[PDB]
Amino acid sequence: ASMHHYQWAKTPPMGWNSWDCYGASVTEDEVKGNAEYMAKYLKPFGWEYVVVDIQWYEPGANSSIYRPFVPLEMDEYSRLMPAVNRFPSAKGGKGFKPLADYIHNLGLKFGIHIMRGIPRQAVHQNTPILGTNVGARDIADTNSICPWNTDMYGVDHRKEGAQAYYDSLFQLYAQWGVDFVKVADIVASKLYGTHTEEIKMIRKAIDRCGRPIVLSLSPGPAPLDHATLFVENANMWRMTDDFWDRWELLYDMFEQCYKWCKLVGLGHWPDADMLPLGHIGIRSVDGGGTDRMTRFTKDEQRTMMTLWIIFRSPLMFGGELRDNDEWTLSLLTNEEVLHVHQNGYGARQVYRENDHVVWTSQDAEGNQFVAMFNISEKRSVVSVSLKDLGCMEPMKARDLWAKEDLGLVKHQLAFELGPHQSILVKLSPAVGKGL
Amino acid sequence: SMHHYQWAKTPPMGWNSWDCYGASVTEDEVKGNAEYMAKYLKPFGWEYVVVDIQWYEPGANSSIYRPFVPLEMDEYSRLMPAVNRFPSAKGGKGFKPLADYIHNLGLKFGIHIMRGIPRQAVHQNTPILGTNVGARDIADTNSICPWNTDMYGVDHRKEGAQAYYDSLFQLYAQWGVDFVKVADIVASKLYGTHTEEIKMIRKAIDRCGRPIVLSLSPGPAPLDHATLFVENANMWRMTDDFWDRWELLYDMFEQCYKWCKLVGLGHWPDADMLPLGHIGIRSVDGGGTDRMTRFTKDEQRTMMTLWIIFRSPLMFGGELRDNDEWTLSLLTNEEVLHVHQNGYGARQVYRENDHVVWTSQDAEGNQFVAMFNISEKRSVVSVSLKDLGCMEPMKARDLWAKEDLGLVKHQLAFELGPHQSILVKLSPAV
Amino acid sequence: ASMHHYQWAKTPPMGWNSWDCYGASVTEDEVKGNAEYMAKYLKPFGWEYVVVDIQWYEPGANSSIYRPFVPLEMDEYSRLMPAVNRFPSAKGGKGFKPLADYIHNLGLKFGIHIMRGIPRQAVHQNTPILGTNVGARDIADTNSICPWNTDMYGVDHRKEGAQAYYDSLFQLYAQWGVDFVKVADIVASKLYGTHTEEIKMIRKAIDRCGRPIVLSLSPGPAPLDHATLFVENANMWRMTDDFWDRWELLYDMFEQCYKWCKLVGLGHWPDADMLPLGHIGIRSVDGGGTDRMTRFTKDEQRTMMTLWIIFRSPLMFGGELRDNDEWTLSLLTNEEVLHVHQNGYGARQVYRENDHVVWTSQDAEGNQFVAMFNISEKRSVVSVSLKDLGCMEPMKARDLWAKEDLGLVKHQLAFELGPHQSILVKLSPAV
Amino acid sequence: DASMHHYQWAKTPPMGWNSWDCYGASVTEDEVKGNAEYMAKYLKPFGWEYVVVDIQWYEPGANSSIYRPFVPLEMDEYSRLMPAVNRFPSAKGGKGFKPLADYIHNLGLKFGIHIMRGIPRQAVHQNTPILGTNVGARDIADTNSICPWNTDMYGVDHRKEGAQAYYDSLFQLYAQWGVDFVKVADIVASKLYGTHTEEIKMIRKAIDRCGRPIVLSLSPGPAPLDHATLFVENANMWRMTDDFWDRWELLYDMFEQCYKWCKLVGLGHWPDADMLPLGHIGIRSVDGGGTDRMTRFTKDEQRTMMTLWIIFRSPLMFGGELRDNDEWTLSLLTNEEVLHVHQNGYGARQVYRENDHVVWTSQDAEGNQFVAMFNISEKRSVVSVSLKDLGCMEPMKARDLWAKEDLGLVKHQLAFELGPHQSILVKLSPAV
Ligand SMILES: O[C@@H]1[C@@H](O)[C@@H](O)OC[C@@H]1O
Ligand SMILES: O[C@@H]1[C@@H](O)[C@@H](O)OC[C@@H]1O
Ligand SMILES: O[C@@H]1[C@@H](O)[C@@H](O)OC[C@@H]1O
Numbered sequence A: 001a002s003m004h005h006y007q008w009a010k011t012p013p014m015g016w017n018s019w020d021c022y023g024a025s026v027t028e029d030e031v032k033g034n035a036e037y038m039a040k041y042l043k044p045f046g047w048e049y050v051v052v053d054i055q056w057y058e059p060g061a062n063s064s065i066y067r068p069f070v071p072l073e074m075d076e077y078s079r080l081m082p083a084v085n086r087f088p089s090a091k092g093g094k095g096f097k098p099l100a101d102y103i104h105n106l107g108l109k110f111g112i113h114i115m116r117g118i119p120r121q122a123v124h125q126n127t128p129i130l131g132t133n134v135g136a137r138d139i140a141d142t143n144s145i146c147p148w149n150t151d152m153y154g155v156d157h158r159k160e161g162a163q164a165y166y167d168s169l170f171q172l173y174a175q176w177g178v179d180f181v182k183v184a185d186i187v188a189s190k191l192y193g194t195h196t197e198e199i200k201m202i203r204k205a206i207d208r209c210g211r212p213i214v215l216s217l218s219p220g221p222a223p224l225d226h227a228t229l230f231v232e233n234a235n236m237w238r239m240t241d242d243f244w245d246r247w248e249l250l251y252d253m254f255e256q257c258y259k260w261c262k263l264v265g266l267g268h269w270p271d272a273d274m275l276p277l278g279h280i281g282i283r284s285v286d287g288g289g290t291d292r293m294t295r296f297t298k299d300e301q302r303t304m305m306t307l308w309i310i311f312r313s314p315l316m317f318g319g320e321l322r323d324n325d326e327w328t329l330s331l332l333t334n335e336e337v338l339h340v341h342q343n344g345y346g347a348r349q350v351y352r353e354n355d356h357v358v359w360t361s362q363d364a365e366g367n368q369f370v371a372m373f374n375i376s377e378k379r380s381v382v383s384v385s386l387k388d389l390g391c392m393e394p395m396k397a398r399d400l401w402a403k404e405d406l407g408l409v410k411h412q413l414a415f416e417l418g419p420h421q422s423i424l425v426k427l428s429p430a431v432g433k434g435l
Numbered sequence B: 001s002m003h004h005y006q007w008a009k010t011p012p013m014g015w016n017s018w019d020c021y022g023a024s025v026t027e028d029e030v031k032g033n034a035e036y037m038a039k040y041l042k043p044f045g046w047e048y049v050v051v052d053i054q055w056y057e058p059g060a061n062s063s064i065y066r067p068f069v070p071l072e073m074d075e076y077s078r079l080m081p082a083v084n085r086f087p088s089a090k091g092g093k094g095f096k097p098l099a100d101y102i103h104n105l106g107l108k109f110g111i112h113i114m115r116g117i118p119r120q121a122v123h124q125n126t127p128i129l130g131t132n133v134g135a136r137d138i139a140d141t142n143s144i145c146p147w148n149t150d151m152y153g154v155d156h157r158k159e160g161a162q163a164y165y166d167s168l169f170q171l172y173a174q175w176g177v178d179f180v181k182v183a184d185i186v187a188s189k190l191y192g193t194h195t196e197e198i199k200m201i202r203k204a205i206d207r208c209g210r211p212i213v214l215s216l217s218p219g220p221a222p223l224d225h226a227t228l229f230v231e232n233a234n235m236w237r238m239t240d241d242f243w244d245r246w247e248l249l250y251d252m253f254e255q256c257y258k259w260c261k262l263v264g265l266g267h268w269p270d271a272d273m274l275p276l277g278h279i280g281i282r283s284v285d286g287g288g289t290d291r292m293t294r295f296t297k298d299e300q301r302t303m304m305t306l307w308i309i310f311r312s313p314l315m316f317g318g319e320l321r322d323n324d325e326w327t328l329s330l331l332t333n334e335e336v337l338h339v340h341q342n343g344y345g346a347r348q349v350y351r352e353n354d355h356v357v358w359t360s361q362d363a364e365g366n367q368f369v370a371m372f373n374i375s376e377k378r379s380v381v382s383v384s385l386k387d388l389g390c391m392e393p394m395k396a397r398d399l400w401a402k403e404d405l406g407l408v409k410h411q412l413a414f415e416l417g418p419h420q421s422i423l424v425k426l427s428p429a430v
Numbered sequence C: 001a002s003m004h005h006y007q008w009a010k011t012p013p014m015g016w017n018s019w020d021c022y023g024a025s026v027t028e029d030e031v032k033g034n035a036e037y038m039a040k041y042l043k044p045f046g047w048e049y050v051v052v053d054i055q056w057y058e059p060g061a062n063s064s065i066y067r068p069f070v071p072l073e074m075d076e077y078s079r080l081m082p083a084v085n086r087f088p089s090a091k092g093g094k095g096f097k098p099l100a101d102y103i104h105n106l107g108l109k110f111g112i113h114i115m116r117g118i119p120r121q122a123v124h125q126n127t128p129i130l131g132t133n134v135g136a137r138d139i140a141d142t143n144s145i146c147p148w149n150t151d152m153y154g155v156d157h158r159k160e161g162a163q164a165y166y167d168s169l170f171q172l173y174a175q176w177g178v179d180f181v182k183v184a185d186i187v188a189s190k191l192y193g194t195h196t197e198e199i200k201m202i203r204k205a206i207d208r209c210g211r212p213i214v215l216s217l218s219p220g221p222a223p224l225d226h227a228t229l230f231v232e233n234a235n236m237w238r239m240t241d242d243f244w245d246r247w248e249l250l251y252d253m254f255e256q257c258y259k260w261c262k263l264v265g266l267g268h269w270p271d272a273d274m275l276p277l278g279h280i281g282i283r284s285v286d287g288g289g290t291d292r293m294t295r296f297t298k299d300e301q302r303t304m305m306t307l308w309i310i311f312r313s314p315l316m317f318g319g320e321l322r323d324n325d326e327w328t329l330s331l332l333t334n335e336e337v338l339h340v341h342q343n344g345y346g347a348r349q350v351y352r353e354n355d356h357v358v359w360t361s362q363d364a365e366g367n368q369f370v371a372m373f374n375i376s377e378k379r380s381v382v383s384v385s386l387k388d389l390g391c392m393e394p395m396k397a398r399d400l401w402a403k404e405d406l407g408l409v410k411h412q413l414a415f416e417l418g419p420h421q422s423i424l425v426k427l428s429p430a431v
Numbered sequence D: 001d002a003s004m005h006h007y008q009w010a011k012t013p014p015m016g017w018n019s020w021d022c023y024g025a026s027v028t029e030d031e032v033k034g035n036a037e038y039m040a041k042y043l044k045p046f047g048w049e050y051v052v053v054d055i056q057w058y059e060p061g062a063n064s065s066i067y068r069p070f071v072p073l074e075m076d077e078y079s080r081l082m083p084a085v086n087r088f089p090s091a092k093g094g095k096g097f098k099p100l101a102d103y104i105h106n107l108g109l110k111f112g113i114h115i116m117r118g119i120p121r122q123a124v125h126q127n128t129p130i131l132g133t134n135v136g137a138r139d140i141a142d143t144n145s146i147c148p149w150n151t152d153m154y155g156v157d158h159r160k161e162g163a164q165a166y167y168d169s170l171f172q173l174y175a176q177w178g179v180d181f182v183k184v185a186d187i188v189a190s191k192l193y194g195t196h197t198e199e200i201k202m203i204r205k206a207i208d209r210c211g212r213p214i215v216l217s218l219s220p221g222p223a224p225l226d227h228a229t230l231f232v233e234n235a236n237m238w239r240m241t242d243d244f245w246d247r248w249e250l251l252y253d254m255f256e257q258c259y260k261w262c263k264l265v266g267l268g269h270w271p272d273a274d275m276l277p278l279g280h281i282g283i284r285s286v287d288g289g290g291t292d293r294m295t296r297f298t299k300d301e302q303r304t305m306m307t308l309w310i311i312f313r314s315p316l317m318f319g320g321e322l323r324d325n326d327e328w329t330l331s332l333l334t335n336e337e338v339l340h341v342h343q344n345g346y347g348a349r350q351v352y353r354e355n356d357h358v359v360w361t362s363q364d365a366e367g368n369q370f371v372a373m374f375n376i377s378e379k380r381s382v383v384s385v386s387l388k389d390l391g392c393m394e395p396m397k398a399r400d401l402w403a404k405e406d407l408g409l410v411k412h413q414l415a416f417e418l419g420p421h422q423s424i425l426v427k428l429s430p431a432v
């Protein structure tokens, strides 16, 4: 806790993100619909961020597939702005402030996605930059683009006015009341790898703007080689390329959790990415799917929530919330599970063998959480000894998702679990307590 | 197999404005180099007058590009000469008048292009001749050149892509272009070799109805694409940009070794331009500025000798009009040039202790031997006749010196200083 | 004609190799049976080399899977020798000379495989090298092994005794009467790439032994980066990792031939590898198979022979020859087809599109050969215009495998071809 | 991090002496004993306790840092390398290192050895037994795993029956001898195979099964961050870098490696900046581009290195021949005030790095703040840092720890003119 911005995400951010349901193309009405649902059914459980994902500045976006080289909505200072057809309250140069105001009044927080860099249409016209006389063209990198989106060019920190530009972006965002930015094309790039210098300029720009804004970075895989950079400069960073509702990616996440578990801490959260639950693909064609309810089975959905919960990943719901059924809503409203996310710490892989995995973490009151997973293709008993958990005596055991006491455990936990199925258990002391 | 081979039966010889003028050569500088060539060089085979990169960039002024600037372009997305630097191009005539002039001097004309389609055309979605699709419809979304900002790559799968490239070589053919040096096409730090654009270019050339020699740059060309190059291009750069630095000339020896088996009629691995004479007038590359080549006279000869015996294309990179007599002599020795024009089979006989020997032959029995001391120490460099495949004594002649040397019984051997070479002809003794 | 050793392989070497049929484990009697069949049925068609493949020095070899870290027969100069149990004529220190004599007396030539380097056991025991007084241990490389075979360590050309050792190997092989050597762990290596310095040492050693020994390098893929080295130093070098009777490997060879076609020439032959035809996998387990007749369909077997013929690959039969049926023998003995391999030149890919591929070559007699291939998964017409072939008027066309005149062709060649099916056509001037 | 019982074996970063930088592969028993005695006498009160015999104690002809390849090695009947009795006479009679370690334990010190990953090639070639089993060394060897810079072993294949039994047997031996520390080589970086993760785990388990506390050190680096979890959970120490030597370029480079590794430092699991080339080194080593010599590090460089290792909390393993130290060299090892930062400091972080100026800070439980300030440029210059940037909320007492000299009150910032390659180590405490 050396870095002031850690205090802005004491626990891992929880919220909703338009990407998995709406792709690049979410409207004001949809945002607000999801915000209202959150306010009323989710906010008591920690869910507070409402994040407008990529390309809110792209008036014609209608998918997860971007329309390349198209005109973007922009101000007179080379800054992108919301598309007024999609966000009508943005009329009159108001930007996202009205939307942000309405979200804040719900008791909720406001987020946006930005692309690293400065828009290409700005560099080519050479539009001005607020606060300086250099123009957009003079701060652009001559060899730095995003391989999967044509909207921007990279900015070169070595040029006069580079920081001025980033500063000016975060002044705008701060005026609008943004509480959370998800930066893209910054951690992993086929072409260039991690854009470290822009991460630094962005941390600087946030710090200078005077409003607390949580910094999320994307896409992954984040290299461990930049662990220290990430831990000191970002509140979240994506461990993985885009996550979707396919078992192979959920399977894969276990190793990434294992590789990143030691960097997890207050204010600096490796990110397992958004939860493809409920109603997705409405205007997204990504993940090899279209308009659907998540292809994860119920066991898969639990398995994911359980891992993300115990690991302390940010939780960003990715479905259209208003179409949650009760099952889906139950995944988000169980306070006993969420305690593991909010107050747990120390999470670690106890072991992984024959596609059985066990993680454990604890709280400050001496409860110990254990998450046990069968990530194989067959039904099998998964178990762990109390000794391997560091429990030197017998313990009471409770199934947190079912909310049901399991009684006393003297030597080990052991459960028959179908393929892709898990269980999350709380262990609490038996010795020196009532009956 | 390939008809375009007949367009470069011997390796191209010429002049190129890059090393002396960077991106910024004027119509006057070109005219004057061409006039010097017609007068002093044409009899020895020098014929291409190549206008290098960025003739379409009115502001160009160095070897360092001005990025993201507007460029001169027609109404079908095709770049055009900058009228300020090329006054004869006024009124949409492009390069036809300069080329005409050059043709009327008995010479050929070439230009440099960048792979792809101008970024400004894609941004503005300007038309493509012969189609209803626009520039933006044929562009690659993830293809740029890492060291220049002018273009986006073209995506051969899009409708209209080949039409675009066709339309460029229609324009070049209207102008009378005889030679095109394509850039950002062979090696790319980001993407490697742009294979599919090499094929569209080949095809656009073939369809335009005029013989246009195809040169590919920058290198290093990968040996992995040897077939593609041999079959599609007349010349291809073995190396990133060559300059007047010993280390780069030293390095070329291995590259020539590496490529020697793909050298052949119509298809020439290219050791790049000759940074001789007066260079860096408006170029700042190679770690130098306005200067005469930093190669010593020995180094110049060593270079000329390797490029000659290997059969690299020869593109003089200095401002010819500032040649002194030494420099002119390197270009006007017929005996040496015969080795380039009519030699074949060049091969490295050996390389050992930074002594190197190359050999080639003509069809009339003559054997050429180039002997090189690329070490830092004076020494005798020798080679046996037997290792050259000569089974009895021969006569030797020093081709640069034009002097007979006498009978060689067993070995050719000379004292050579560091960086110094000799080129010898052997033929039957009396 | 710059390298004298080019004249040892003026046309692409043709023969039989024990690997595909017997793995590491062939016996003398098996070699002899194959050589007898070759002498009787194949020799006049050009087939002449009888090549004993890897580990003739490993008495317990029994498959294509090597027995690691086991003892190896060796002489008193650190040189591997044949296992007398498998090669009984080698009894009493005679090595392969008696078996080489037998094969020479059938009118045939004799080949062996060797592993690059010097035996590990020789380095550990520090046994002697002939012609010098450093031991084996002093010439070994300290960081060079084969990732897939444990027999040897690499030899370090910077050490005194290194060339002496390679020289001694080729003295022995020449004493034996070896005419061909296939060297392994030398072209491609997952750990180290191409072993160029050993290639040079072996070239020199062959040149010094005073017998023509054709030099074959393996396994691939050969990098184009070393094309000059290969061209000047070897008579054949493998374009590919080990080839087997699997359609996918056959599909993949089309590209490799394209990539190497400009280096094919007299004495220096890019090698598409041994032909997995007939009865293979008797004591081999490679290629995903066991004891079998080739899993290539007849169409695939024709496709392979067609490509290898026109491209001018060496032709090394990998099956047990005595189990050839008539069909299989016919693949090896079509005079008209062999003409393209023996007397053609200039092979090139005319095009490759939607998995249809056309190759062409010619002889000096006026004849142009065109090999047309459907390498797609569906029946389709494959075609090419006389013009794309560089043919300026009507030509008589003949199917070479079928030996059947197809008549006059005025504009193009066009054939319905099954998936994986091919045709080989000669075009000649209209009567 | 607190999960693993072996963390308790290295609560502070191991401190000791290692034979590599002074004697290569070639140290004798008398040299080990001499350095041990020196340690017991002059250094043990400041935390120095490990006496580590480096590589190739089993190679009787060894004579340098350059290995003699493919040579027969001293080995028991169970495929386990044994001390060369010519170099370690007290090992005569199959006693191995027990006598030597007993000697060192009696000085109140701890004993360390170096091992190469794997099983000896000669064991595999002869197919010598694996203790406690009916399998042979040949049955457990990998057929494609070697060290690119040493020929002594083949890798062990964890999937083979007996593989774990072999490693268990090694650590039974080492425990019998009384070994307290093992430096394992050819395990973290390999130009040919990368990190040998499965052998790391076999070794962890063998140690856990042997019944004695044995500190696990891994080498050589660079250790990839990609395996940070593995190293943190399985080892007490792991090399950040390839072998470190008395050259400035290598010292300069370590600054970035510490920056990269600083979040994985913690009780029981210490990223290692490698042994300290101080004093008399290169006596039977030819590595580092040097020969027999006193270290080529200037005093400033020596301090700069001590200071970064101190504040970062790298283990400290002296690589010179201790009996030849001067008072200067000794003074680097005996300053309690500096060592408190290594022993009791935590949270070490780079405050910033700019124009070859670097500042690190850490703190202790008493709210002292330690700050190390480095000029790693080629120019003399003033290096500074604000107390705001140190997160010191108000004015502070300052003290130069190496000089042991109060600097008085500091209100706004620390600033010092430092030579090139020169550093200072300061402690800030609350005022009055
Ligand atoms: O979730 C994805 C993310 O990886 C980003 O970089 O680009 C678009 C979406 O926001
Ligand atoms: O000679 C250089 C060449 O390498 C090319 O690629 O770019 C511009 C110049 O023409
Ligand atoms: O044909 C294979 C070959 O590729 C070689 O490298 O080793 C074994 C067989 O001889």
Ligand SMILES: O[C@@H]1[C@@H](O)[C@@H](O)OC[C@@H]1O
Binding pocket: D020, D054, D055, D114, D184, D185, D186, D219, D220, D221, D242, D243
């Ligand atoms: O210190 C070096 C170390 O890096 C090891 O890997 O090899 C021998 C020495 O102990």
